[PDB]
Each structure stands twice: as C-alpha cells, then as structure tokens.
C-alpha cells in the first residue's frame, strides 16, 4: 500500500495525550501495516525520527442502535516513540 494510506488518523484520548507528554503519538493505521512500515510512513510524513513503534490490534466492539446490532470496524493502533533530538509532531 501507499505510505500516505498506511496512517489513517491520530488518536486523541486521555491515554494518548499522556503519551504525547512522553513524546509518543498514537495513530490508527491500516490493519495490514506492520510496525516497520508504520515507522517508514511516519518518518516520510512528519520529518521526525522514530525511536520505537508499539502496535496493537483493537478488536471490533459490539454495538446496537435500536433493533439492529452489529460490530464496529476492527482497528490497528500504533504508539510511535520519537527519539530525542527530533521534531515533535503537531496536531
């Protein structure tokens, strides 16, 4: 896939904001993207240098509106830790 398609969007939550304080950013990524590809995509997109990348699979969450019940789409969440001496990602 294309690097620009690897990363979908950032994750803004309390845990993600604490991560940012530690200079790590949480992104939703393509479910087929491995952490090495995620590292490459982040470097190309943001000019930063990546120290490490952690990655999790967020399972689909059951939901229901009225009489219809289904599942939210499965997601892939990546926590990217930038090295020192690296520009911060701005959101």
């Amino acid at each position: 896939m294309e690097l620009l398609d690897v990363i979908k969007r950032p994750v803004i939550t309390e845990k993600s904001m604490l991560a940012m304080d530690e200079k790590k950013y949480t992104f939703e990524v393509d479910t087929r993207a491995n952490k090495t590809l995620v590292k490459q995509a982040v470097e190309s997109a943001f000019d930063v240098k990546v120290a490490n990348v952690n990655i999790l699979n967020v399972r689909p969450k059951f939901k229901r509106m009225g009489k219809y019940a289904g599942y939210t789409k499965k997601r892939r969440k990546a926590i990217v830790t930038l090295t020192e001496d690296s520009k911060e990602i701005q959101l």
């Binding site: 294309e2 620009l4 398609d5 990363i7 979908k8 969007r9 950032p10 803004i12 997109a45 959101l91």
Partner: protein, 59 residues
C-alpha cells in the same frame, strides 16, 4: 476537472496524484481533530484521484 486531467502529462498526472494524496492525508488528520470545516472536500479529493487514475489507465 476531467478536462484538465486530460490536458496534463503523464508525469504531471502522477505529481498531481501525490499532491492529492497528501491533501487527503491532511484532511483525515483535520477531521480526526475538530479543525476541519468543509467535510465535502474529502470526497471531492478522493474522486479527483479516481479521475486521475482512470485517465492514467485509459492512456
């Protein structure tokens, strides 16, 4: 628009595709935050890339 896409050259179309992809990436980030107003622009950009790819394939 489709007329302009046909006017452009092969290298120009590829560069335009890259620019539109970057813009779509930026729009996704802005939508993820609250900083995006013209939400329809996302669909416009996606369909623009589709037009460019369609022209590229029909060459």
């Amino acid at each position: 628009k489709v007329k302009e896409i046909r006017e452009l050259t092969t290298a120009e179309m590829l560069d335009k595709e890259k620019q539109l992809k970057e813009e779509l990436f930026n729009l996704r980030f802005q939508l993820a935050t609250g900083q995006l107003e013209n939400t329809a622009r996302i669909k416009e950009v996606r369909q623009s890339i589709a037009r460019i790819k369609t022209v590229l394939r029909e060459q």
